[PDB]
DNA sequence: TGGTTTTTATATGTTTTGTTATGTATTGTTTATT
DNA sequence: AATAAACAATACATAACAAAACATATAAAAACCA
C-alpha cells in the first residue's frame, strides 16, 4: 500500500544473522543468545518506524466466542460456560450480568 | 531446472565437424532473470571455481610494429575458448559491445574489420549471463518479452533462459530460513557426509571421463517426438538448442 | 376548431479519443587516450 | 576502432484536458385525425 516499501528478502535475514553475530561479538561471547535477535529486529523495525511521525465482560465475551467458534450453539442451558467461568478466576454475579446483557443483545 | 541446466551445460554435449567446410558444437548459452537477492552470484562464482578457463566480466587483434606482425591480445571470452564464461548485469551492459556477443551466440567467431586488420577467428565457449528485469524485478501485469528490456532477435537466438523469480509465500521460505540456520545450529559442518551427495573430486573425475569418452549419436528414432515438441512453441534456434 | 400524437429544440450526461506541456531519462557530440 | 567523461539536445511517459461520438429528457412546435 501507500506507506509500503520493498519486501522481505533472504539477504535481510542474512543481515539480521550478521547483526546478531556482531552483537555477540561486541559482548565477546562464543555463542549467540536470544537477546541479540530481539535487539536486531527492533533496530530494523525502528529504522523505518520514523515515517509515522479493564476487560470486565470482554474476557467472558472471548470465552463465549471461543465456545461459539468450536460448536456454535446459542442455547439456554449453560453447563460448560459456567464451569469455565468458575475456573477462569472471576465471580458468577458478573457472569449472570453478562448473560443478561448478551441475551438483551441477543447473541 | 537451473541446476540441471548448468550441470548439462558443463557436461557440454557433442562437437562434430566436417572435413573441410563445416563445424558444430554441442553448446548452450544461458541467461538468468527474475527476482533478485538469491543464489545468482553464488552460481556465477561457483562455476568460476569449477572450470579451468573463464573470466568474470572479447579480445582484439593488433598489428605489433616491433615484429611487424598481427598478434592477438586478450582475456575474457577469448581466453576461455574452452569452458564457460560468466557475465553479470546483462541489462546494464552497453549496446556497442552487444554486437560481439551476437556473433558468439551460435556462430562462435570474432570478425574484426578495423585499421590494420580484417580477420575472422575462432572464439567458442559458452556464456552464463545473469540479468535483471529493468527496474521491475518482474511484473505479472506485463509480458516476459518487455519486462527484461532485452531485444527479441538476440533472445530468440539464446539457447536457454531461466525465470528464477521467487514469488514469496508460506511453507517454502520457512524451509529456506531453516536450512540457512541449520548450519548455524552447529559451529562446524562435520555432519555433511551422511546424505546422498557426491564429493567434488569424484564429480569432476566422472565429468572429465564422460566429456572425453562419449560421442553420442542422435538417431532417427527420436524424430517423431521432436517435431511435435517444436510445433508447440510454433503454434530453428530452439530446435538447435 | 380540438384533442392527441409526433417531432424538434434545448439541455445535460457518458465514454472514447486525441492533443499538449513538462520533468526526467536517454542519446548524441566532442575531446583525450588506448 | 574502442573507451571514458562532461555536456547539450532530444525523446518519452504521463498528467490534464478538450472535444467529438454516443445517449437521454422534456417543454414547445407541428402535424394530424376527427
Swiss-Prot record, chain A:
Amino acids binding ATP 2: 11
Compartments (UniProt record): Cytoplasm; Nucleus
Protein name: DNA replication licensing factor MCM7
Note: Present with 166 molecules/cell in log phase SD medium. Early fractionation of eukaryotic MCM proteins yielded a variety of dimeric, trimeric and tetrameric complexes with unclear biological significance. Specifically a MCM467 subcomplex is shown to have in vitro helicase activity which is inhibited by the MCM2 subunit. The MCM2-7 hexamer is the proposed physiological active complex.
Quaternary structure note: Component of the MCM2-7 complex. The complex forms a toroidal hexameric ring with the proposed subunit order MCM2-MCM6-MCM4-MCM7-MCM3-MCM5; loaded onto DNA, forms a head-head double hexamer. Interacts with CSM1 and MCM10.
Residue numbers of the full-length protein present here: 677 to 791 of 845
Cited function: Acts as a component of the MCM2-7 complex (MCM complex) which is the putative replicative helicase essential for 'once per cell cycle' DNA replication initiation and elongation in eukaryotic cells. Core component of CDC45-MCM-GINS (CMG) helicase, the molecular machine that unwinds template DNA during replication, and around which the replisome is built.
Coiled-coil positions: none
Gene designation: MCM7
Top-level taxon of origin: Eukaryota
From Swiss-Prot, chain B:
Subcellular location: Nucleus
MCM domain: residues covered: 1-181
Motif Arginine finger location, chain numbering: 156-159
Effect seen on changing residue 40 to A: Loss of MCM2-7 complex helicase activity
Binding-site list for ATP: 34-41
Subunit and interaction comment: Component of the MCM2-7 complex. The complex forms a toroidal hexameric ring with the proposed subunit order MCM2-MCM6-MCM4-MCM7-MCM3-MCM5; loaded onto DNA, forms a head-head double hexamer.
Primary role: Acts as a component of the MCM2-7 complex (MCM complex) which is the putative replicative helicase essential for 'once per cell cycle' DNA replication initiation and elongation in eukaryotic cells. The active ATPase sites in the MCM2-7 ring are formed through the interaction surfaces of two neighboring subunits such that a critical structure of a conserved arginine finger motif is provided in trans relative to the ATP-binding site of the Walker A box of the adjacent subunit. The six ATPase active sites, however, are likely to contribute differentially to the complex helicase activity.
Other remarks in the entry: Present with 8800 molecules/cell in log phase SD medium.
Family: Belongs to the MCM family.
Name of this protein: DNA replication licensing factor MCM4
UniProt organism field: Saccharomyces cerevisiae (strain ATCC 204508 / S288c)
